[PDB]
Amino acid sequence: SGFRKMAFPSGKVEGCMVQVTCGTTTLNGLWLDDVVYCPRHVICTSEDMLNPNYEDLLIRKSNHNFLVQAGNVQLRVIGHSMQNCVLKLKVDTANPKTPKYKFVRIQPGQTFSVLACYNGSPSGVYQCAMRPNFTIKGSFLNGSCGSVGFNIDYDCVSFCYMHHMELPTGVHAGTDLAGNFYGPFVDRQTAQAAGTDTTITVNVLAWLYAAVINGDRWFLNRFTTTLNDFNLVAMKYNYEPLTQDHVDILGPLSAQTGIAVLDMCASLKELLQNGMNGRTILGSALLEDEFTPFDVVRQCSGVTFQ
Amino acid sequence: SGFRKMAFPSGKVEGCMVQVTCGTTTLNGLWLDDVVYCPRHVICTSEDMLNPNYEDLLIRKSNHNFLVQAGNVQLRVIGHSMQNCVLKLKVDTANPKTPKYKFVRIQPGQTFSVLACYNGSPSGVYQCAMRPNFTIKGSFLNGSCGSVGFNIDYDCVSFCYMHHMELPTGVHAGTDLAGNFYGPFVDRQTAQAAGTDTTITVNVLAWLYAAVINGDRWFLNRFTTTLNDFNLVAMKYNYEPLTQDHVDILGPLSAQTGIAVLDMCASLKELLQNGMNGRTILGSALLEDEFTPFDVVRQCSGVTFQ
Ligand SMILES: *[C@H](O)[C@H](C[C@@H]1CCNC1=O)NC(=O)[C@H](CC(C)(C)C)NC(=O)[C@@H](NC(=O)OCc1ccccc1)C(C)C
Numbered sequence: 001s002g003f004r005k006m007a008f009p010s011g012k013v014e015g016c017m018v019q020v021t022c023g024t025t026t027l028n029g030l031w032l033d034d035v036v037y038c039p040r041h042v043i044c045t046s047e048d049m050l051n052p053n054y055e056d057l058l059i060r061k062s063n064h065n066f067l068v069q070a071g072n073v074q075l076r077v078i079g080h081s082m083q084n085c086v087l088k089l090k091v092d093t094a095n096p097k098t099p100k101y102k103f104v105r106i107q108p109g110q111t112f113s114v115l116a117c118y119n120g121s122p123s124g125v126y127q128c129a130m131r132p133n134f135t136i137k138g139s140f141l142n143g144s145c146g147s148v149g150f151n152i153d154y155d156c157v158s159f160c161y162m163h164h165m166e167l168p169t170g171v172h173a174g175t176d177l178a179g180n181f182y183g184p185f186v187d188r189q190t191a192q193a194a195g196t197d198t199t200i201t202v203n204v205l206a207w208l209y210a211a212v213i214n215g216d217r218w219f220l221n222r223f224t225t226t227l228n229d230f231n232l233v234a235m236k237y238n239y240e241p242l243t244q245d246h247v248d249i250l251g252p253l254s255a256q257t258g259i260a261v262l263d264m265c266a267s268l269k270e271l272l273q274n275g276m277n278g279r280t281i282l283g284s285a286l287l288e289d290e291f292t293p294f295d296v297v298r299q300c301s302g303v304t305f306q
Numbered sequence: 307s308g309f310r311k312m313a314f315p316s317g318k319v320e321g322c323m324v325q326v327t328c329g330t331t332t333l334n335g336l337w338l339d340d341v342v343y344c345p346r347h348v349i350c351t352s353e354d355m356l357n358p359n360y361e362d363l364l365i366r367k368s369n370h371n372f373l374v375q376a377g378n379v380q381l382r383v384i385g386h387s388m389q390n391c392v393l394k395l396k397v398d399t400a401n402p403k404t405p406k407y408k409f410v411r412i413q414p415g416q417t418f419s420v421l422a423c424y425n426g427s428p429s430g431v432y433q434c435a436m437r438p439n440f441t442i443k444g445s446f447l448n449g450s451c452g453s454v455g456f457n458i459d460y461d462c463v464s465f466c467y468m469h470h471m472e473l474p475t476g477v478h479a480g481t482d483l484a485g486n487f488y489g490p491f492v493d494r495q496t497a498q499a500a501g502t503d504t505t506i507t508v509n510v511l512a513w514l515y516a517a518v519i520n521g522d523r524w525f526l527n528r529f530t531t532t533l534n535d536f537n538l539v540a541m542k543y544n545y546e547p548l549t550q551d552h553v554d555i556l557g558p559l560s561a562q563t564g565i566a567v568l569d570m571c572a573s574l575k576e577l578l579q580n581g582m583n584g585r586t587i588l589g590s591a592l593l594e595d596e597f598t599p600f601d602v603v604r605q606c607s608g609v610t611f612q
């Protein structure tokens with residue numbers, strides 16, 4: 001028993017991290033087969049960064065301008081090309097540590113692990129959710145760009161995020177591995193704001209099921225509600241709408257605990273209307289929304305990976 | 307910017323995890339050089355476990371009773387011996403993935419990363435603190451015994467914890483890697499209880515400094531207090547005493563933020579006496595105590611590891 005914010009084991013990704021230095025910029029790259037993926041704004045300098053034209057900046061570059069460093073071994077760049085907001089640097093050596101992988105784009109509400117890196121060297125690993133407003137609430141310092149977010153599916157690493165920038169509220173924006181931003185952000189030093197966020201309702205209910213599996217039941221109640229009456233309550237509290245699909249994904253957790261999804265909705269309603277009365281749930285005094293139904297099942301059932 | 311509960315990258319430890327099966331018990335082992343470390347209660351079966359005599363149970367075992375599995379490669383056991391509550395199984399193959407390592411025993415209040423494993427296969431990684439009552443609040447299911455907790459110091463892995471058991475409040479108990487339990491617990495199925503916990507005051511103050519570095523300042527105040535007047539307030543709220551040493555370790559954070567340690571104590575006092583008034587600090591509605599002063603510096607400064 002117990003419930004923790006749990007990251008995927010990071011070994012498979014640590015072996016793919018390299019340092020990319022060009023001009024006055026150093027950042028992290030992702031080395032899979034003979035390609036190194038990194039944020040395209042490495043080809044910049046601090047005045048290029050007010051409003052650049054990356055297509056122009058890139059034809060001015062030479063292969064030998066890109067210093068790629070895999071630990072204490074240098075990689076020769078033999079080609080370069082830009083795919084949206086990422087650079088693909090072709091190197092003459094294929095990474096012998098390349099895991100089975102996919103590039104996947106995730107949906108708001110879904111979670112992933114982030115391997116925070118500096119200078120090609122992993123610093124820490126932590127779990128994140130993609131917020132409804134396509135930001136993530138990460139922990140990133142200068143030099144962390146090119147760190148990647150990922151999920152693991154048995155032995156396959158699905159890369160879903162590459163880090164690019166911090167927005168003024170301390171939240172973070174980035175791209176998928178094909179270089180397409182999550183949300184309406186651009187890799188420019190121009191005024192940009194996150195936009196209004198909402199709470200991920202299906203994840204909150206999942207975390208309430210995790211609590212019940214773990215012995216926290218005080219918030220349960222005999223009442224029930226309709227899907228429609230629940231969604232009027234979520235609207236007011238800035239929760240995002242609950243669909244019949246979300247009810248289906250919560251079926252397994254409903255079955256394991258004996259609590260109908262719509263009964264747990266009625267509990268969420270009262271929690272929203274009454275607060276928590278100085279009590280806690282799974283050691284939080286807030287309703288937590290960064291655990292998906294799948295995260296809960298993995299942790300409360302013991303799924304592993306090879 | 308941003309602050310997250312951040313684990314160490316786990317790759318160095320993933321390469322050391324193996325599966326140990328003996329009789330009707332399967333658990334995880336730690337494979338360093340030609341020795342596999344695992345909990346001694348693997349040599350048990352479910353009626354041995356009410357009150358065993360492990361010295362007796364172990365001389366009855368044969369080397370060939372221990373099935374050690376490093377992925378899809380079996381390791382031959384060539385010797386066995388017991389060191390307190392862990393077994394050391396000598397195998398004829400040294401682990402080519404053995405990192406530089408140390409066995410260290412940690413102090414209550416200190417943190418570490420846990421690589422939760424089942425059947426020798428890593429499942430997830432998360433950060434823990436050793437509670438004042440020598441339990442940890444982990445996430446462990448049946449089959450997770452032998453999972454280890456650790457810190458990384460540049461390239462060196464300091465192993466500090468091996469998992470053994472869950473106590474009735476859902477908290478977890480284990481040993482250091484020399485097999486000596488943290489706290490007054492024994493690896494027996496006899497009635498055992500955690501004992502009264504307290505809040506780790508120095509870590510709470512560290513997390514308040516992390517908040518200030520990250521832009522949360524609402525809890526700051528013009529007031530101050532003495533170390534002595536602060537400790538009378540901590541006593542009442544079940545916080546553990548703050549020493550002049552703790553004030554010294556908080557010096558760096560005090561210097562970076564311009565907030566004297568005793569000024570942050572006065573803020574903690576009011577937070578303890580008034581609550582948080584429905585506000586949050588670093589996205590928590592509770593005072594968080596599982597970040598050490600070092601954890602805060604690492605995350606707010608960007609220390610890496612190779
Ligand atoms: C890559 O190492 C780095 C990662 C940042 C550094 C601090 N935290 C991080 O996650 N990314 C950058 O330095 C960005 C570079 C560009 C913009 C992608 C070229 N810069 C930023 O992240 C900056 N954000 C912005 O410039 O955009 C928002 C904004 C809002 C208002 C006015 C101007 C710009 C921040 C300021 C570091």
Ligand SMILES: *[C@H](O)[C@H](C[C@@H]1CCNC1=O)NC(=O)[C@H](CC(C)(C)C)NC(=O)[C@@H](NC(=O)OCc1ccccc1)C(C)C
Pocket residue numbers: 001333347355446447448449450451452470471472473474478493494495496497498499
């Ligand atoms: C090892 O895989 C496993 C890990 C447990 C399983 C569930 N969560 C975990 O962390 N450890 C065990 O199964 C323990 C085996 C012994 C006791 C070390 C031989 N057993 C336990 O963890 C059990 N705890 C106790 O038996 O001790 C406390 C207690 C309190 C009151 C009455 C009897 C015993 C629990 C019940 C699984």
